[PDB]
Amino acid sequence: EALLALVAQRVAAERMFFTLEDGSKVSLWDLQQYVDNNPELAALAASVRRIAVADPEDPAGRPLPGGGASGLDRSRGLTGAAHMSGQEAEELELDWGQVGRGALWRRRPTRWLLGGLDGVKDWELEAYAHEPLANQLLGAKYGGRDPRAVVADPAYAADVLRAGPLLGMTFVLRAARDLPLQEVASSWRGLLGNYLQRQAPLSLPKAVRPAHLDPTDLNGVAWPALLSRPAAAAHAAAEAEAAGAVPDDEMGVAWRVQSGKEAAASVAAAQQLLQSLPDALCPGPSPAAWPLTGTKLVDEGGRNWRRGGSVWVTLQPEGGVLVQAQTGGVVGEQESYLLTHVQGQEALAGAVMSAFMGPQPLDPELAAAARSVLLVPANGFTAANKERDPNHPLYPSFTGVRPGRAPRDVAAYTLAGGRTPLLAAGGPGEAKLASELRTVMEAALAAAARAEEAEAAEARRARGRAAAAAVMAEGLRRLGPDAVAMLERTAAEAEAPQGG
Amino acid sequence: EVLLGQQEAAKNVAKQLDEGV
Amino acid sequence: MPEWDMEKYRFYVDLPGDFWESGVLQRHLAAQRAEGAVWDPASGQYILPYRAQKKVFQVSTEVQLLDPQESWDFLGWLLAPGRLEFYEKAACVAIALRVLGIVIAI
Amino acid sequence: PWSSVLLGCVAATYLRAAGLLCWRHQRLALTAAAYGMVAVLTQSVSTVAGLLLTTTIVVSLYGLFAAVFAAAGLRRLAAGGLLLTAAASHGLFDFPNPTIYSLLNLGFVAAAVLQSYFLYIAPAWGVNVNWDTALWGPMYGTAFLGLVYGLVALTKFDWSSVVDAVLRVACWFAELTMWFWDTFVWKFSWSEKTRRA
Amino acid sequence: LALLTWMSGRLPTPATPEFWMLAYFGFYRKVWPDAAAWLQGYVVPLMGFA
Amino acid sequence: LALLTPTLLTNDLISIKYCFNNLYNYISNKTALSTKNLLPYLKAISPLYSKFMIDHSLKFITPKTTLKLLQHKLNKNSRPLNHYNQALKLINGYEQYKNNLQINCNITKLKLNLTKTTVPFKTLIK
Amino acid sequence: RASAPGGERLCKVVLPPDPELLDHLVSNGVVVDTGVTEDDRLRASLLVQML
Amino acid sequence: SVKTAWRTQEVLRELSYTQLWALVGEGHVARVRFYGPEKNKVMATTRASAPGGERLCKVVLPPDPELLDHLVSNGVVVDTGVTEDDRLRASLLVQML
Amino acid sequence: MAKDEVKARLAPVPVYTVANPKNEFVLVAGENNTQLGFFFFRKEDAEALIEKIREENPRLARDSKILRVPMDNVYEVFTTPREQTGLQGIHFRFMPDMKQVAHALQLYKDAGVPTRQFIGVPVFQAEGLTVTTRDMQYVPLFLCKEDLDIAVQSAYVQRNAAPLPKVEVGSFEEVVMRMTASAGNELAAWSQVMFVAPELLRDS
Amino acid sequence: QSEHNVKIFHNSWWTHLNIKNLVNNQDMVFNSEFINSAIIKSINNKTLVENYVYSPSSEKETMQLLLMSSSILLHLCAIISLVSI
Amino acid sequence: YGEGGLRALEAVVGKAPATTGRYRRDLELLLAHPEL
């Protein structure tokens, strides 16, 4: 009957598996039953009740010491956005850092009139980029250079427009008004059509490796094994030349050009998919049948979009545009909805990216701020100081040590033993200890050359690393802790800020 | 007294703003 | 026992001025709220520990504070029963002497 | 008109130009001659209407002294027209038979309406105003003063109506204060001195 | 103003020292900061200045 | 008595320019020391999963070296602690979110709220 | 909340000086709304005390 | 500009915490008198060796728990203006009442 | 460190410049560009530049005054690229004391080097000299050899007893660049720095 | 939920009694005046500082006089306002 | 700070009542005779 041989058989026996922790594989039917037909546990799940474990190896209970008040848990009473401590944002993925702020003005507030009493705001515009991918792309090419020269070059602007799907630029448009649905749909359709009429045939990436996430390890990913290969770069380049070999500088991406953004194709296809915005968001006249109704993203009648709701437009590679949304107010009551996800529409991703960070964007301040912030994750720092780096360009972490003022006393100054690090650089002691460290390193380089396709070369490099570590360690025990500090600062002030 | 049954969803926000009462 | 079914002595205690500074009530509350409904992975199930349970004559202390603004002393004094009796008498006399003065229209 | 909204304001000042033996007409003619020279080279207090006029003169003087003294040339033409605005307001400062200045007043209010159209719809039509403060400010200011001149002139207004409105507001607040005192603080029959003892 | 008028029988005209005491110790010392802030943020830009 | 009462009762572009100044000074100081030896932008969101985004975008990148942030991601008791039925269901909801994102790549109420957080501007070193 | 015993209701609670209460409310996802709290207590609580 | 202005009595001269800390560390402040209901204001009497001689300055602070470990660390004696004579006068006034 | 921490640690070091009355800079220009701020650590060298300006252009010397500025504002001046400010070419070099350059050369001579050449402003420090604050132990960097000698002699005569603590001298520009670019254990090493003013342990 | 009633008989039997002279062990056979000592001590110890008169010597005498004047005037104003009814 | 300085119960079940103990005989008799 109703696919009795097809909706049964446990959909290909549910031969797609997962992987939890210690290699245990579970079926998707089992996991779907766990989230669907196990609602008692879900009653606890939507109550944030604390339970606390017991120690299993203890004869007498003894509730295990936990600190569970994590950022998401404590933030459930806040409004708008959650709040973490940086380390918890480093965990739970959370790798899309903010690169720019903006606004979609109806009437732009003038500093004249009455302070700006004509300042009607339709949306608040924020742009977010994947910071590790921003580092890996814009940092190994545009890293260690003058940032003003980089942002002055029109090649950097072209590159941050081209590599936008690669960075996964997601734009959050938060409604600052009870906006009518038809007006917003017409405005977005008109703006995106205007930007589609100027989307010339331009450059897109091409795939260098297929597959990943086969239907047995849907929990797993291929990139850590790809980046921790026995030869890595050699293997990656070999894959590259067997398809699209990188022509650019140290960035990857082969960049096919022109035709990739076809005109009568995907551009016109997107000009039709935009026509199926006011017949997919505001269909035939019945404000209870319009898809976005009932949910908190609109009002009770569904006519207007409520103030505080946000629309998340993420530009995936291969022309994928993911439009999600999120209601406003208390985050403990916020509900997030996936609205649409289009794939293969290379004109939509390029048109949205041009509309946000183009030569004429929807907000020039947002485009300039995003293209200017992006060098901070490019230089291996992230937009917000999640790693608590003291040398951050903006929002640097402090050492937490009171600054010292030299007193006009004599009893405070004591001539103790060898318990001061060297602070005078360029002196005879520093120069002679640098010379002794130099001869120790030269002995290490000489000893690493006697340690005797690319996998055997990397094994030889590992053997040379072991011999160099042995010789350098013996030399550093011959020298002092000040020499250890000098080797540490020499290693620190020699690598590029990008981390290459 | 009057029969003008106006409909608006911002009146809920106004009633919530009457928490000052 | 359910509290509504209990029979309770109501004792009067004069607390010291450093009662909150000494933190005896705070320590008792922190001792009482420190346990209950502990998950046990060594055997499954949620276990209420024996430390979270009560002994034969041990009860759960219910700390309730009073608001002095709920004591409407002026209104309770103005609407005291004797004053209410006087207002009833004066309203009776006033109504009778207002009627006698309208029904004299003859 | 983007950068030619400034040309619209220039047309407004040209409309201001559309509108004997005493010194005041000589001063107005000297100011008009100064406007002509500046334009070709760069390329009393006892009335409310007098307050607006004086304000206009002061503002527009600071405007000329911040732009001209300190399609790019429209930024200098629209500020050269501020001296024409100052000339019109110094003409209206003695508003001297009133029929001499009536047509000047009509042109002043009509081009004030035109500037209060052009500059007000300028941010919503594409051009930005917040960029140059010392240039962009005084034209908005003189358009504002020009509009409130077409409101304080058209209806007689004067300091008498201002004093009457202030007295009415203070009187209503006074009766509210007396009612609040007599109802909540202390009855006036208790506070005052009962006579006939 | 109302209380002084009721208590003294004379409205504080600008020729009366009570008006100047209420102008200095009243308007100037108390509400003029607020008035100043509001004015510099609403009227002074509306006048084209700053 | 009221005189005696207290007695008796006993533009982000400017920050962009500053950040660029700090970044250029840091790079120049690093270079000079090498030769001599030899509040906005505080928000973090996650619309997709970072592992999935790196895997999807690494099908186009041939990296000759792993940089600092991706190396940190590569580099990154507690076994009984995260063993509430709750803690063994939340990770299942994470994996169902994973499969939903994968099958969307290959109006629906999401199983979990999209995560948008703030990080404090002033912190201390480790 | 509606999941509370007795439905959704408003209840007045007078608090002891407990320094862990705000941390408990924050970590248990409770919307902690204070209000105004004007600094100048002498000036703010003057006319209402006269009344 | 002590050679340019006229002399006008001797008013206090409001400083700040930073200023006072500098002249305490440099050993220019001889005595401090904490005052204010909130005790956040200080009369600083400087010594004759200071660049300016004895001046009674007035300082306003944030609540920083390091004032003692600078004042009594260097040279400064804390004092209050209520001596035993003033206390006995207060006792006499209470007796008269 | 951060620039706030570096400016906070560089506060007790004063320097002297020559300024026109509206807080300008007597920037000796020499030949093609090459303007030089010459932040003078010693006031005698600043008065010598005043004498040179007096002999060259007598109108400027009357207007100009010796401006005292703490090293935090000097660091703020030094850090920012001057092309961004729009006034570039002004070199802003440091002028060390000749007596302390001679002392630095003498201390260089102990190991045996080209002892008639030095780079930057000398900063002196004894290997083993520490200042005991409230519960932390700062490492004083001495801008003056005489102050270092007073501290070393007083400390060993107070703690009893051979007692020659190495005494090493480096460049003040490098101890600022290392403070700026230090991140690892060098950050913790520099967090205990303490800067002695050139006249702090005088005849008091 | 029950509906209450106004109690009108014997409402507070402990109020219309003078138990003070029995409880404080009078008639068989605590001390004040720490109050005014503490009040004048606080007046002296804080005194608000007349820095506008460059901290004059008397000062505490002025504050004590102000306190006595304010107390006397408050009591007299209360009596006059009471008898004004 | 302090003096002295150097140095299936109370962790499974938790303490023992102190004010209780005078009712031990009555509790035992109530258990022994359920007819009460």
Q: Go through chain C and tell me how many residues it has.
A: 106
Compute the distance between CA of residue G35 and CA of residue G13 in angstroms, rounded to an integer.
16
> Quick one: how many helices (H) and strands (E) in chain C?
4, 2
Q: Report chain J residues whose CB lies below 8 A from the CB of C85.
A: 8
Selected residue of B6, B8, B11 to mutate for chain A interface (largest A Cβ count, 10 A): B8
Compute the distance between CA of residue A252 and CA of residue A209 in angstroms, rounded to an integer.
12
Compute the distance between CA of residue I48 and CA of residue I55 in angstroms, rounded to an integer.
11
Own/partner pairs for H90-93, CB < 8 Å, 24+ apart? H90/J37, H90/J40, H90/J41, H90/J43, H90/J44, H90/J60, H90/J64, H91/J37, H93/J40, H93/J64
Sign of CA dihedral A433, A434, A439, A444: positive
DSSP states along A328-365: -SBTTT--EEEEEEE-S-HHHHHHHHHHHHSSS-S-HH
Compute the distance between CA of residue D115 and CA of residue F85 in angstroms, rounded to an integer.
71
Cβ neighbour number for residue H24 with a 10 Å cutoff: 22
Q: What are phi and psi of C93, to 5 degrees?
A: -65, -40
Radius of gyration of chain D from Cα atoms? Answer: 24
Radius of gyration of chain E from Cα atoms? Answer: 15
Sign of CA dihedral A40, A42, A48, A54: positive
Look at residues D152, D155, D151, D7 and name the one whose alpha carbon lies nearest to residue D81.
Answer: D7
Look at residues I14, I17, I15 and name the one whose alpha carbon lies nearest to residue I46.
Answer: I17
Which of A:67-96 have CB within 8 Å of D? none
Compute the distance between CA of residue A425 and CA of residue I172 in angstroms, rounded to an integer.
9
Interface residue G42 vs chain F (CB under 8 A): yes
Selected residue of D190, D191, D192, D194 to mutate for chain J interface (largest J Cβ count, 10 A): D190
Compute the distance between CA of residue G30 and CA of residue A48 in angstroms, rounded to an integer.
11
Q: C-alpha dihedral over A265, A267, A273, A274, to 10 degrees?
A: -160
Q: Report chain A residues whose CB lies below 8 A from the CB of E48.
A: 112
Q: Report chain H residues whose CB lies below 8 A from the CB of A407.
A: 25, 74
Which of F:42-71 have CB within 8 Å of A? 42-71
β-pairing verdict for I94-95 and I39-40: parallel
DSSP states along A237-267: HHHHHTS----SSTT----B-GGGS-IIIII
Compute the distance between CA of residue D149 and CA of residue D155 in angstroms, rounded to an integer.
10
Compute the distance between CA of residue G33 and CA of residue A83 in angstroms, rounded to an integer.
17
Resolution attained, angstroms: 3.2
Distance, C-alpha I65 to centroid of its chain: 21
Look at residues A56, A68, A97, A250 and name the one whose alpha carbon lies nearest to residue A159.
Answer: A250
Q: What are phi and psi of A63, to 5 degrees?
A: -45, 125
User: Which residues make Cβ contacts (< 8 Å) with residue F99, sequence separation at least 6?
Assistant: A16, A18, A28, A31, A218
Range A255-294 burial, b when 16+ CB lie within 10 A, else e = beeeebbeeeebbebbbebbeebbeebbeeeeeeebebbe
Range D120-149 burial, b when 16+ CB lie within 10 A, else e = bebbeeebebeeebebbbbbbbbbbbbbbb
Look at residues E44, A116, A117 and name the one whose alpha carbon lies nearest to residue D55.
Answer: E44
Compute the distance between CA of residue A494 and CA of residue F30 in angstroms, rounded to an integer.
7
Cβ neighbour number for residue G30 with a 10 Å cutoff: 13
Interface residue D184 vs chain G (CB under 8 A): yes
Look up residue H54 and give its DSSP letter.
S
Please name the helix (run of DSSP H) or strand (run of DSSP E) that holds residue A413, with its range, or none. Answer: strand A413-415
Look up residue K18 and give its DSSP letter.
S
Q: What are phi and psi of A328, to 5 degrees?
A: -100, 180
Looking at this protein, which amino acid is placed at residue B8?
A: E
> Quick one: how many helices (H) and strands (E) in chain F?
5, 3
Distances in Å between the alpha carbon of E2 and those of A311, D187, J63, J84?
56, 15, 32, 22
Compute the distance between CA of residue A497 and CA of residue A135 in angstroms, rounded to an integer.
10
Compute the distance between CA of residue A17 and CA of residue A55 in angstroms, rounded to an integer.
32
Looking at this protein, which amino acid is placed at residue A302?
A: G
Compute the distance between CA of residue J77 and CA of residue G50 in angstroms, rounded to an integer.
14
β-pairing verdict for I94-95 and I65-70: unpaired
Sign of CA dihedral I83, I86, I87, I92: negative
Q: How near does any CA of chain G get to the CA of D194, in Å?
A: 24
The two structure tokens encoding residue I2: 């951060």
Compute the distance between CA of residue A311 and CA of residue A327 in angstroms, rounded to an integer.
9
The two structure tokens encoding residue H86: 């003033």
Cβ(D171)–Cβ(D165) below 8 Å: no
Please name the helix (run of DSSP H) or strand (run of DSSP E) that holds residue H44, with its range, or none. Answer: strand H41-46
Look at residues D79, I116, F57 and name the one whose alpha carbon lies nearest to residue A136.
Answer: F57
Report helix, strand or coil for H72: helix
Look up residue A325 and give its DSSP letter.
E
Cβ(A271)–Cβ(A280) below 8 Å: no
Cβ(A197)–Cβ(A207) below 8 Å: no
Cβ(A143)–Cβ(A378) below 8 Å: yes
The two structure tokens encoding residue G26: 């924050």
A134: buried, middle or exposed (CB in 10 Å: 19+, 13-18, 0-12)? Answer: buried
Q: How near does any CA of chain A get to the CA of K24, in Å?
A: 27
Own/partner pairs for E4-11, CB < 8 Å, 24+ apart? E5/D174, E6/D178
Strands (E), I1-82: 14-19, 39-40, 65-70
Compute the distance between CA of residue D80 and CA of residue D73 in angstroms, rounded to an integer.
10
Cβ(A258)–Cβ(A201) below 8 Å: yes
Q: Report chain K residues whose CB lies below 8 A from the CB of A60.
A: 8, 11-12
Looking at this protein, which amino acid is placed at residue C93?
A: V
Q: Report chain D residues whose CB lies below 8 A from the CB of J83.
A: none
Look at residues I22, I17, I19 and name the one whose alpha carbon lies nearest to residue I40.
Answer: I17
Q: How near does any CA of chain D get to the CA of G25, in Å?
A: 41
DSSP states along A52-99: -BB-TT-TT--B-------HHHHGGGSBSSEE--SHHHHSS---EEEE
Sign of CA dihedral D103, D107, D112, D117: positive
Selected residue of G14, G24, G25 to mutate for chain C interface (largest C Cβ count, 10 A): G14
Partner chains of E (3+ C-beta pairs under 8 Å)? A, D
Compute the distance between CA of residue A60 and CA of residue C35 in angstroms, rounded to an integer.
14
User: Which residues make Cβ contacts (< 8 Å) with residue A473, sequence separation at least 6?
Assistant: none
SS (H, E, C) chain D: CHHHHHHHHHHHHHHHCCCCCCHHHHHHHHHHHHHHHHHHHCCCCCCHHHHHHHHHHHHHHHHHHHHCCCCCCHHHHHHHHHHHHHHHHHHHCCCCCHHHHHHHHHHHHHHHHHHHHHHHHCHHHCCCCCCCHHHHHHHHHHHHHHHHHHHHCCCCCHHHHHHHHHHHHHHHHHHHHHHHHHHHHCCHHHHCCCCCC
DSSP states along A360-402: S-S-HHHHHHHHHHTHHHHTT--SS-SS--TT-SSSPPB---P
Cβ neighbour number for residue C35 with a 10 Å cutoff: 17
Percentages helix, strand, coil for chain A, rounded to the nearest 5? Answer: 35, 15, 50
Looking at this protein, which amino acid is placed at residue C34?
A: A
User: Which residues make Cβ contacts (< 8 Å) with residue E48, sequence separation at least 6?
Assistant: A112, D59, D63, D137, D138, D139, D140, D141, D142, D144
Cβ(A271)–Cβ(A348) below 8 Å: no
Give Dmax (Cα) for chain B.
Answer: 28
Cα distance between the two ends of chain J: 45
Look up residue I199 and give its DSSP letter.
T
The two structure tokens encoding residue E39: 């004015």
Compute the distance between CA of residue I139 and CA of residue I53 in angstroms, rounded to an integer.
40
Look at residues A312, A358, A308 and name the one whose alpha carbon lies nearest to residue A331.
Answer: A308
Sheet order of strands, A310-315 included = A82-83, F115-118, F43-46, A96-107, A120-130, A170-175, A310-315, A321-326, A336-342, F108-109
Cβ(D31)–Cβ(D98) below 8 Å: no
Compute the distance between CA of residue A313 and CA of residue K15 in angstroms, rounded to an integer.
60
Which of K:1-36 have CB within 8 Å of C? 11-14, 16-17, 19-20, 23, 27
Partner chains of B (3+ C-beta pairs under 8 Å)? A
Distance, C-alpha F54 to centroid of its chain: 15
Please name the helix (run of DSSP H) or strand (run of DSSP E) that holds residue A313, with its range, or none. Answer: strand A310-315
Cβ(A486)–Cβ(A434) below 8 Å: yes
β-pairing verdict for H77-79 and F115-118: unpaired
Residue E31: left (phi > 0), alpha (psi -120 to 50), or beta?
alpha
Look at residues D6, D118, D129, D112 and name the one whose alpha carbon lies nearest to residue D53.
Answer: D112
Range C82-104 burial, b when 16+ CB lie within 10 A, else e = eeeeeeeeeeeeeeeeeeeeeee
Cβ(F105)–Cβ(A316) below 8 Å: yes
Please name the helix (run of DSSP H) or strand (run of DSSP E) that holds residue F5, with its range, or none. Answer: helix F5-8
Cβ(I182)–Cβ(F125) below 8 Å: no
CA-based nearest residue in chain G for residue A78:
G31
Distance, C-alpha E20 to centroid of its chain: 9
Compute the distance between CA of residue B13 and CA of residue A36 in angstroms, rounded to an integer.
36
Q: Report chain C residues whose CB lies below 8 A from the CB of F84.
A: 39
Looking at this protein, which amino acid is placed at residue H72?
A: V
Compute the distance between CA of residue G8 and CA of residue A451 in angstroms, rounded to an integer.
76
DSSP states along J28-70: T-----HHHHHHHHHHHHH----GGGTS-SSTHHHHHHHHHHH
Look up residue A17 and give its DSSP letter.
B
Sign of CA dihedral A283, A289, A293, A299: positive
Selected residue of A136, A217, A251, A422 to mutate for chain F interface (largest F Cβ count, 10 A): A136
Radius of gyration of chain A from Cα atoms? Answer: 29
The position carrying tokens 């993203």 is A297
Paired with I204 in beta bridges are none
Solved by what technique? cryo-EM
The position carrying tokens 């930007």 is A195
Question: How many contacts, defined by CB atoms under 8 Å, are there between A and F?
Answer: 366
Cβ(C40)–Cβ(A54) below 8 Å: yes
Paired with F115 in beta bridges are F46
The two structure tokens encoding residue A492: 């620190």
Please name the helix (run of DSSP H) or strand (run of DSSP E) that holds residue F50, with its range, or none. Answer: helix F50-57
Put simply, the answer to whether J9 touches C80 (Cβ < 8 Å) is no
Q: What are phi and psi of I43, to 5 degrees?
A: -75, -25
Q: How many CA atoms lie within 13 A of K20 on its CB side?
A: 13
Which of D:157-196 have CB within 8 Å of J? 186, 190-191
Compute the distance between CA of residue H84 and CA of residue J73 in angstroms, rounded to an integer.
30
The position carrying tokens 């207290």 is F6
Look up residue H95 and give its DSSP letter.
H
Compute the distance between CA of residue A136 and CA of residue A252 in angstroms, rounded to an integer.
9
Interface residue I181 vs chain F (CB under 8 A): yes
User: Which residues make Cβ contacts (< 8 Å) with residue A72, sequence separation at least 6?
Assistant: A82, A84, A88, A92, F115, F117
* A150-A153-A155 Cα angle (round to 5): 105
